[PDB]
Amino acid sequence: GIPKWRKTHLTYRIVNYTPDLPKDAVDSAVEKALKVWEEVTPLTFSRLYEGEADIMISFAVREHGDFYPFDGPGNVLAHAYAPGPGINGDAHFDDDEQWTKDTTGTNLFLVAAHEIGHSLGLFHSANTEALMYPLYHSLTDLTRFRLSQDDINGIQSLYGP
């Protein structure tokens, strides 16, 4: 049990969107990913807009010169930060892509959950069922979407024993 600077309560701000799908696809994705860890660990969060919350989810168009420029439908889908004094819980999404919620391309629901897991304080796992797997695993079977002992131990180290 050792979370972000020992803080149990984290705030998140939506500063990203999707040019292809409705706002429910992006806003609810951030919250579902954010609360997917709430449904697994006793973490407390709040969604606001002030200026900059603990976790800042922003969009990144082709002018993405902070790590990698736009690649289009390329494997590079997004990047996030976590153990930092400023970049604490901050991520970016490739706006120039097909963001879907039904694995029809770039599943932002799955990617966001993976990015939120990162920002919360986790890296990459090894199990194929793990939400933090370092390789694209777009599965049409959304009924099998779950957490596994692999990623579980990771989030457990953050907010658990």
Ligand SMILES: N#Cc1ccc(-c2ccc(OCCC(=O)NO)cc2)cc1
């Ligand atoms: N169940 C399940 C499950 C579902 C999806 C993934 C999945 C998809 C794309 C990814 O792309 C973003 C690149 C990255 O690693 N960023 O930090 C990484 C992970 C894994 C497991």
Ligand SMILES: [Ca+2]
């Ligand atoms: Ca891409």
Ligand SMILES: [Ca+2]
């Ligand atoms: Ca931040």
Ligand SMILES: [Zn+2]
């Ligand atoms: Zn970036």
Ligand SMILES: [Zn+2]
């Ligand atoms: Zn990752």
